[PDB]
């Protein structure tokens, strides 16, 4: 059973608890035993800069603290990605999606889950759309 690396929640917890990351994404690792971290995006980072990156043939997980307004109020919800799209070899797909309840239980105080596996599902208006749902 692929293990979730510590580095993964102290990233998650550096984003959850100090607010210092804008997103966390998350790969498996070179021997398919560990997840891993991936890439840190800073305070500032944009939507643009996480789903930019995203690889057409493989899958990520990722975090992202989502922030909008309601009302003139800010928000912010925490939401776990699984981006796993239809191109990805079937091994990949696989191994993502039966290591998604290991790590997902790891990163305590996700609010919201996105499952895309295509350009207009990892969208930033399918986000935000489930995120203030």
């Given at each position: 059973?692929?293990?979730?690396?510590?580095?993964?929640?102290?990233?998650?917890?550096?984003?959850?608890?100090?607010?210092?990351?804008?997103?966390?994404?998350?790969?498996?690792?070179?021997?398919?035993?560990?997840?891993?971290?991936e890439?840190?995006?800073?305070?500032?980072?944009?939507?643009?800069?996480?789903?930019?990156?995203l690889?057409?043939?493989?899958?990520r997980?990722?975090?992202?603290?989502?922030?909008?307004?309601?009302?003139?109020?800010?928000?912010?919800?925490?939401?776990?990605?699984?981006?796993?799209?239809?191109?990805?070899?079937?091994?990949?797909?696989?191994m993502?999606?039966?290591?998604?309840?290991?790590?997902?239980?790891?990163?305590?105080?996700?609010?919201?889950?996105?499952?895309?596996?295509?350009?207009?599902?990892?969208?930033?208006?399918?986000?935000?759309?489930?995120?203030?749902?």
């Amino acid at each position: 059973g692929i293990a979730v690396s510590d580095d993964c929640v102290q990233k998650f917890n550096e984003l959850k608890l100090g607010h210092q990351h804008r997103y966390v994404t998350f790969k498996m690792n070179a021997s398919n035993t560990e997840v891993v971290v991936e890439h840190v995006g800073g305070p500032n980072a944009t939507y643009e800069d996480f789903k930019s990156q995203l690889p057409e043939r493989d899958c990520r997980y990722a975090i992202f603290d989502y922030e909008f307004q309601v009302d003139g109020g800010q928000r912010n919800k925490i939401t776990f990605i699984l981006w796993a799209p239809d191109s990805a070899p079937i091994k990949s797909k696989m191994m993502y999606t039966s290591t998604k309840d290991s790590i997902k239980k790891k990163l305590v105080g996700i609010q919201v889950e996105v499952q895309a596996t295509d350009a207009a599902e990892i969208s930033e208006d399918a986000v935000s759309e489930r995120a203030k749902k």
